């Protein structure tokens, strides 16, 4: 059995989704220890993992899969697939409007174009599970693109991306060149870069030929490019994560709330500005020797520093968690998880009627969240809402934010369930005022596909 299939079988036998995610990432960069990778290389260095095992990714994705999805699925140029080529130091995109049929796509490939599938996880369930698991240990949306390049060609101009990238060589070989950030500002860049010409580039910090099974990681800001040399194409899947998930992004959400809080709670923020500060402040006075100006700037720095005491850090953390739940790919259940959840209840249609009717929860039922990263409790305008991922589309933001309200008499028990995973809790022992509230919370979550039971319900 291939390493990918072996580890996937292995994950199905691991109870915790948190541990499953950790294990899969361990597999992704093996033999490199994750602890070393995050401590020393994550967001700092380009890394090549020379696998010396061409079968490592077998089962993940292949060119055969691509060809088949073009004929059996509704793959559209632009929306789902791009065809580009880099020649004469110039990038060109050749997307014809409409459906990308095998005849058109392969015609472009034959003429030198690279093909790029934007959301492979929407057409492949393997890629979907792969990213759905890894997103749990990234704490960030895990996206991906698939790149197929014909022999003796380059599809894209050198550039840098706005995400942490993990390149997985699936077929053929490709000559890659990775450059360290060209300048202080391009280090851990915020946005994708424009296309660069070779003259804009220095020396590669990494130049090598990737072999199926190999892994090549590099931070946002690291310029890269790649080309197929004589006689063989290249197919690779680039896993991406950490888009706009910086400390600066956290502050962006924090500040407006902090200053509002400060103004409402401390009179020093409500005092009026000088009646004549326009006399010494402004670009026209950037060189004024007026001390009132120095006093103005000093006061500004003091009040700003002060805002730290008014920052609603927990509320912004919850908001980001809520947006991540919305961004999330839906969970891929283990056979056990499905079997012990509403998804696996044996009730279906036979002969002329429903069979295996009406299993019901009781105070004796032992439960716990279906998985660790599928829900988040959030407070908004006096109400509490549990946002979950189980009804999200494999397509980014196709379905809108899903939640269900959690009533006050259930908040303690909901927090408990969210923090004890994967420990089982007898429904009767949930911190609720009445038994009606215990059964009601457990029933609502279970019916939602957010909970699983120790023993399959059979009532």
């Amino acid at each position: 059995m291939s390493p990918l299939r072996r580890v996937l079988a292995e994950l199905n036998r691991i109870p915790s989704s948190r541990r499953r995610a950790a294990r899969l990432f361990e597999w992704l960069i093996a033999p490199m220890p994750p602890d070393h990778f995050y401590r020393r290389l994550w967001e700092r260095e380009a890394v090549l993992v020379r696998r010396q095992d061409h079968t490592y990714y077998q089962g993940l994705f292949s060119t055969a899969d691509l060809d088949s999805m073009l004929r059996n699925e509704e793959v559209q140029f632009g929306q789902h697939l791009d065809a580009a080529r880099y020649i004469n130091g110039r990038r060109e995109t050749l997307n014809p409007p409409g459906r990308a049929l095998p005849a058109a796509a392969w015609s472009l490939y034959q003429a030198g174009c690279s093909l790029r599938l934007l959301c492979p996880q929407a057409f492949s369930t393997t890629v979907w599970q792969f990213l759905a698991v890894l997103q749990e240990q990234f704490g960030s949306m895990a996206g991906s693109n698939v790149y197929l390049t014909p022999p003796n060609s380059q599809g894209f101009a050198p550039h840098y991306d706005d995400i942490e990238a993990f390149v997985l060589q699936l077929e053929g070989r490709k000559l890659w060149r990775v450059y360290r950030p060209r300048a202080p500002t391009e280090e851990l860049a915020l946005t994708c870069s424009p296309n660069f010409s070779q003259d804009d580039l220095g020396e590669p910090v990494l130049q090598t030929v990737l072999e199926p099974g190999d892994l090549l990681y590099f931070p946002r800001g690291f310029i890269h490019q790649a080309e197929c040399q004589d006689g063989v194409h290249s197919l690779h899947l680039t896993l991406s994560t950490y888009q706009r998930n910086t400390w600066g992004d956290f502050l962006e959400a924090i500040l407006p709330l902090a200053v509002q809080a400060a103004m409402e709670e401390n009179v020093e923020f409500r005092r009026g500005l000088p009646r004549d500060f326009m006399d010494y402040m402004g670009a026209q006075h950037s060189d004024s020797k007026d001390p009132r100006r120095t006093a103005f700037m000093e006061k500004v720095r003091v009040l700003v520093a002060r805002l730290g005491h008014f920052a609603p850090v927990d509320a912004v953390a919850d908001q980001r968690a809520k947006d991540f739940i919305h961004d999330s790919l839906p969970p891929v259940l283990t056979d056990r998880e499905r079997a012990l959840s509403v998804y696996g209840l044996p009730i279906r249609w036979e002969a002329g009627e429903p069979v295996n009717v009406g299993a019901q929860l009781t105070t004796e039922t032992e439960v716990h969240m279906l998985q660790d990263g599928i829900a988040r409790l959030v407070g908004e305008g006096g109400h509490l809402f549990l946002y979950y991922t189980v009804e999200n589309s494999r397509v980014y933001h196709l379905e809108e934010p899903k939640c269900l309200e959690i009533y006050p008499q259930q908040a303690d028990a909901m927090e408990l369930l969210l923090g004890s995973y994967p420990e089982f809790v007898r429904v009767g022992d949930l911190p609720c005022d009445s038994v009606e509230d215990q059964l009601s919370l457990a029933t609502t979550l279970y019916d939602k596909g957010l909970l699983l039971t120790k023993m399959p319900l059979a009532l």
């Binding site: 959301c119 996206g143 550039h159 991406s240």
Partner: peptide, 12 residues
């Protein structure tokens, strides 16, 4: 402005 890798799985 330049977007090479489509992280969110779709263009703009």
């Amino acid at each position: 402005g330049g977007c090479n890798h489509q992280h969110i799985g779709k263009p703009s």
